[PDB]
Structures are given as structure tokens and as C-alpha cells.
Amino acid sequence: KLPPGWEKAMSRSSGRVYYFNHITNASQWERPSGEPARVRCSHLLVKHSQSRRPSSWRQEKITRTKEEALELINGYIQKIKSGEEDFESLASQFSDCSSAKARGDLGAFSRGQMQKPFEDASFALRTGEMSGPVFTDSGIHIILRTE
Ligand SMILES: OCc1cccc2[nH]ccc12
Ligand SMILES: OCc1cccc2[nH]ccc12
């Protein structure tokens, strides 16, 4: 029926059908369109107090809760989707990964290199697509597939 990971859902607020991907946590109104050895992705990471290393270039000791990190992630996604902010700008300013200095770009990678939830989401995105919140031991990620 639908591409890998996608399913139909019903909006509670509006009643209209939408589509949700349980691998990437993406959601959208439009029906999803249409695997490579390698993909190229950028990401924006928000760490929290239970991250494997609760420290980053932005903060020596990260104290925000997981719930607070998810709220920050949700807000970044909202501004990216409305066009108020670009993914690259938010990643450079607010990502708790040192890849912030390269606008979030991780370069190209294969399966078996990244943490599993990150890898699975990266390879389930189509080129140009963006994930919802993706949870790893490092924190919560927004992933943008660029190639
Ligand atoms: O690695 C330190 C550093 C140098 C230059 C730009 C940066 N952005 C985030 C960390 C960072
Ligand atoms: O493995 C997931 C991942 C990929 C690339 C950069 C990252 N930084 C923190 C986690 C992380």
C-alpha cells in the first residue's frame, strides 16, 4: 500500500486523514510518494539530563528534562515546517552535536555505523525528507536526508 514505515491515521482535531511513519516519526497530510548503500544526512540534536553524555559545546552540564527536550524539538520542527526558520540555521545555533559547526551535516554513511534508531530513520527518509523526533541514547534528533 504505502512506502516503508507509513500508515494512515485520523486527525483528532479536524477529522481528516493523515499519514504517519513509525520509523521516522514523520507526519503529513499528503499521501507519501512512491535501498541505497549509503545516505547523507544532517541532524539537530537536543540533549537532556538522561543523555549518555549530558554535555555539549552549548552547555557544560545539560540539565533539561527529556520532556523539555522533546518540547524544544517539537518547536524547531514547527518553525521549519512553517518556513519561519531553516533547518540549517537552527542546527547551527541550537544543536547539541558538534556537527552544528557544519550546519548539522554528518556526511554520508552506511548501515552499521550510527545508533540504530538514527540509522533506521535515516534510511527510511526519502532524499529531501525530514524526520519527526527520533530518540537515541544521545538525546532527541531531527534528521534531514540530503542525499
Ligand atoms: O568544536 C568547537 C566549535 C568550533 C566552532 C564552531 C562550533 N559550533 C559548535 C561547536 C563549535
Ligand atoms: O548515532 C547517532 C548520531 C549520529 C551522528 C551524530 C550524533 N551525535 C550524537 C548522536 C549521533
Name the method of structure determination. X-ray
94 shares its domain with 121: yes
Structural domain harbouring 3: 1-32
- Long-range interactions of 12-16: CB distance < 8 A, separation 24+: none
Query: Ligand 2 test: best mutation among 39, 40, 43, most atoms within 8 Å of CB?
Result: 43
Residues 69 and 117 in one domain: yes
CB distance 57 to ligand 1 below 6 Å: yes
Which residue is closest in CA terms to ligand 1's atom 4? 101
Kindly provide the resolution of this structure in angstroms, with one decimal.
1.6
CATH of residue 76's domain is 3.10.50.40
User: Do 51 and 81 have their domain in common?
Assistant: yes
Is residue 17 located within the same domain as residue 67?
A: no
Query: What's the structural domain count of the chain?
Result: 2
Identify which of 58, 122, 51 has the alpha carbon closest to the alpha carbon of residue 96.
58
- Supply the DSSP symbol for 129: -
Provide Rg for the chain, Cα atoms: 15
C-beta separation of 133 from 140 below 8 A: yes
Q: How far apart are CA 90 and CA 130, in angstroms?
A: 14
Q: How far apart are CA 26 and CA 15, in angstroms?
A: 19
Same domain membership, residue 82 and residue 136: yes
Least distant ligand from the CA of 114:
2
In the chain, the largest separation of any two C-alpha atoms, in whole Å, equals: 47
Same domain, 54 and 7: no
